[model samples]
Target: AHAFWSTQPVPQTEDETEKIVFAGPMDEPKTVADIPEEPYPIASTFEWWTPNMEAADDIHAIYELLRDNYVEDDDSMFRFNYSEEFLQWALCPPNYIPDWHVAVRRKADKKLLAFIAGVPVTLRMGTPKYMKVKAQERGEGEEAAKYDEPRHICEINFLCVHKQLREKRLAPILIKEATRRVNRTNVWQAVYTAGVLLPTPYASGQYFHRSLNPEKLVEIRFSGIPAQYQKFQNPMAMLKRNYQLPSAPKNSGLREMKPSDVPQVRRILMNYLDSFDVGPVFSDAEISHYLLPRDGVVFTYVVENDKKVTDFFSFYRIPSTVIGNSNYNLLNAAYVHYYAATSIPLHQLILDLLIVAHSRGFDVCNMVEILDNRSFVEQLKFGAGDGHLRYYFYNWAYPKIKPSQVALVML
Candidate 1:
């Protein structure tokens, strides 16, 4: 069924899982010599472009392309509307290459047709115990050397094509071009997620949403009030009462993250993430870039108990445009970022996040059923969302991972 996917190095289906001997790259290690100096051929009517994130025009173009063409829900009620500020922060993180922002445009008018991007990430997998075992078996080589260590990987995202040109088969080419660009940088592994089932996935996480504004969600058909709630004379008010959050978080030392706390936060995050089967290894610069609060973009809160950092959590703002909604134009959403709790219970930490998000005017808070989040999501009133996000790897192979084993969250 996957004409393009069938040709790729990835395992073709879930059935192939048991036949695998071990986990590693599907293809042999390749150097610069194996890469093509030229870009892949495409229809002459279209040309390739690398949209500069720093340039306002380029950023706007990318935004415009995605705003109208990006992923949407099954019923088409809403579509992901990634803001320009969010894109700048997500795509231009520390050590990000500008050329990985691949785009396609019509030759005549130069209108954007399709787009894809790869942000550099250092993914760490397997604990020291597992790494040592794999290392002993493989001996010494380029692949074996990185067994337990953090790996330089590309996080691919925002693959979109205009509705008018979907028949042109631009998706495969965009993926190929992005892969080639990433490989040129000598990084053979990549990660991405999709709502649809792919040939194979390293892990799959279900989207869970906590409604901050229950009334608006029901009105927009984003969710439905339970039959019991609907039976009430004032269902909207009744539901809102049930979903209301505290005016302030209950944690005593909880507050926004500061630059001074960077070192402690980094240590806590790294130590916390080491347990996951798949997760990122953050450096000092990357930690600061990702965790530091950006006004109206990404939000992080830390708990300091008696001058010691004990717990931290973050949520990034990514609002979606409510299509055909006469009453509301946008749905402000907060997605769970890196979170760790030591001084307090994980569920309590997440509840504090919900309170913060609600106070900041977010319509809802969202998270995947990965990490220790399972401890809190349902207890905090988060309903199961309709879609599943399957994580995929490019030119890499590994045993299928359960949702609980996945700690890396892609934007």
Candidate 2:
């Protein structure tokens, strides 16, 4: 049903899924020699502009475009309000290229109409059973072994178009232009998420929300009081009590992550990632860039037993503007980013994390049914949310992944 996606290199239908006998790059592997030097053609009335996020005006323009026209909830009750500071942290991660921040605008007035951005990251997929056999049959077992190595791919996100131009087919153009820019840099694959199902999805996760401020959530109509709880004398109060957390974390050694703990965090994080079928293969620099706490932006905690890092959990702040709510302007949210538990149980670690988020005054804690999260979602009393994030990869194919196998979390 996606006209543009049908023409792309993605698996087009269920039949195509059956024909995928190997798990590897979907496109005919190409080198830098094969990539085009020129950008794809643009309409005469419109022009492509690569915004320098470092510049105040450019980042502000990008922010405004997203704030006004980007993703919203199914019922339009709320929309993601990514802050300028948050955008800087998310977009300009270590080694990010400015050229990948693709934007389209009106040539006459310079009005930004559409935007898409990509950041470089490494994706590592666990070897499938047939992959080794196929490799052995082709006498390329060593090459297949190299598949265990991390491959650089762009994490494509923030694709948006002005509502007026939704039918103008600017999205696919933005996507292709970003792909071209990335391929020119010798990268071939891209990862992105969408609410709507495209040709195929590697994995899908249901959204879950743990309300920190139940009253405001009900008042804004973001969520409803459960029918069972409606009979209470004060259902909202009961709901708040039900969702409340302790002031401090339960784990004895758990505390805010320090700069000195980067190496340990990276090691513990990597060791835990091996359990998943697919996820980011983080480097020391990427771990520090992503996990190191940024005040009001991201929060990371580590459990250190006698100076030995035992467990770690991290969440980032992403607030949404409460649409149509005259009483409140913002709905502060903390999203679970990456977590790994060694000494502490997964459920206990998450419970402590919720306490910290509540202490920080986050209106809600949001997470997906990925990784070991299924083990704790019910234990922590997180209710199902009305959103589903569909994970997709460009020029890559794999068997459909279960929710538990999806360890990677996209910001």
Candidate 3:
């Protein structure tokens, strides 16, 4: 039999000196009835439980809601561009979690409410330290800088919530509970990705970091690109702003993505990312975790009319941003974390996204940044603005972290 969550050992990391306190799981503070609703009454409740790899369908459901309903963009097709290989690697179960610690909240009914599935991975700041230390051994000055500090950090990937349960206002509870659990492992700081701007559900003006104290949260700026290059400014404004599709006589075509397309998607996205030094690759398991076989959240939109996934988009929603906990009037907002096919016409997809958001009665949608898509950004006819945030990092043995990548958006 699997072990219960309480019995598992909590992992320790960079902040060995700190004592992390946690309040064990309690009945969810918020419920479906607590949030306002229109059209239909979709009531619910939630709790933090471990993910059952056996319940792949439940996990996939969360992924679908996150990818489709959250982001504002309405690509002609419903698909996200990530290699399947990454999906396979990302879906593997994680260690350091009590069986129960893997959170899987339920709506009042037994139906799977919301889940933070997949494993919590670790990064030990060692090799980089060794490289820097070796340089110092040779008496190199600048080279030795790399070995000066030893730091370890924790990374949590694959966080999602159910679409039907969204309005229930369970986001804060989810975030609060998840981080509280992660803290027990002795990792002072935890990290996740958020977009600066995009018209889709996944887009946000800034990353959600309320789970951490504002004082402890630090911004990670990019290598050399100015915030403008990445469209880091005005994240929320982009949601309202409209960008028409520009350039390109090449229409890739639209169709459901099959297992075969995974390799190309992974290769292209990873290769494109090589230009920038920020966005981390989602492991193949991560992709699988995101996209399951029949019921998985993974949807594909390809422009195969010509023969390829030239244009597509991924749709999904996650817990609302934790802005209110840290500051006043930040307003709880859904995190639209979907990806749009850059190769397709953004405006066409966005119109569809807006329709979905309006039908669902969402307050607003957000995106991270419009980097590398100036042509489309300028054409957006909607309102937009630059969002500002502050971030920080701790230093120890050697230079384990170079710097925090700053994020902004046009919404």
Candidate 4:
């Protein structure tokens, strides 16, 4: 229930249409002077703590807290496993401050119990009259086309409380403390995402799965034999046979993103994201921090024509542990991150991406069905997931945004 969230600045479902004057921030703006000097109070047994990003043990404490209590699937058959490397990369993007890495620890034991994080992100959001995204269509006035000023908002990520401590109602306290820390820096607005329906949803989308190692997936009950692949008696064999991929990639210029390509990638990426109704406006420093190729955290590739980067795509690793399965212990899932296409077609680029992901020892490559992903989901044989991911803005409000128009991907 939204018993805690209902009192916040979030827009509710029963919010009337005629009463809505504009599609901007829901709460009136407040400056740093309005915020309090002290963090919100917690139980006496527990105290607030800010983990150091540069320390090794602090990173492990966060990794352990998330690994055990973050989330599970519908049947609880799989658990998301987070590596310390992934956490460090995720928590410490450009403009990240030490205080935003919020946590609660047992007073006597000094164990991390509840954790939440917020990072600086710049996104441009505006709901136009017709939502026709062609830049070539109308170069006219505000009524013809509309775009909001780029808002520097805090992106709330990786909110988790220890399983046993959930009954203690530490979640709301965790959120409020994180909010207060973010407010001190003059960022009144924030964004969050969830798989469950809450007070309201700004947009919605699904996660599609492309089977890389079908046998391991089937053995672990992560997926079932689809009706199309089950027409034959040897369904297991049929599934593996059909999901075969090439050993080599097709595009000659496709390779790992380099440090020098950040400027070019930023130029192409920002222009492409502008066509969407909601997405991030990434700076060159952000592009290098997020899109640069990290060993086990993120992998980004760019397509070049005559040594100039024209197109780029990326995905991050988030593997899950197979519960109670003998044959397999881990499920390497690569979630689709961000991509911008100009030279190669979208579907072909994704197919080539699958080839690269498969070669990297991933069991499944997952795609969040947003942006231009629907074009390739069916064409390349990605199975639909049962659950839908709902996207929400903390203080910002708009009537509705279609999945196709959403380009922001939260890890």
For all candidates, what are the clash counts? 0, 0, 107, 0
Candidate 2 colliding pairs: none
Candidate 1 local lDDT, 276-326, one digit each (tens): 878899889999999999989999999999899999999999999899988
lDDT tens string, model 2, 5-105? 88787888867765654567777878887877887888899998998889888889988988888888878878888988888889998899889999999
lDDT of each: 0.86, 0.85, 0.36, 0.84
TM-score (C-alpha, index-matched) for candidate 1: 0.94
Name the regions of candidate 1 deviating beyond 4 angstroms: 19-21, 126-146
| lDDT by residue (tens digit), candidate 3, 175-249 | 445555544444444434433211111112332111111121112110122244357475323322322222332
Q: Quote the lDDT for 142 in model 3.
A: 70
lDDT of 4 by residue, 229-347 (tens): 66799999989988999988888899999999999999998888888777898889999988899998899999999978988999999989777887788899998888888898988
lDDT of 2 at 380: 94
Each candidate's root-mean-square deviation in Å? 2.6, 2.4, 15.8, 3.0
Give TM-scores for every candidate, taking all chains together and pairing residue i with residue i.
Answer: 0.94, 0.94, 0.39, 0.94
Cα deviation of 279, candidate 4, in Å = 1.0
TM-score of 3: 0.39
Model 2: ten consecutive residues of lowest lDDT: 125-134
Worst 10 residues of 3 by lDDT: 214-223
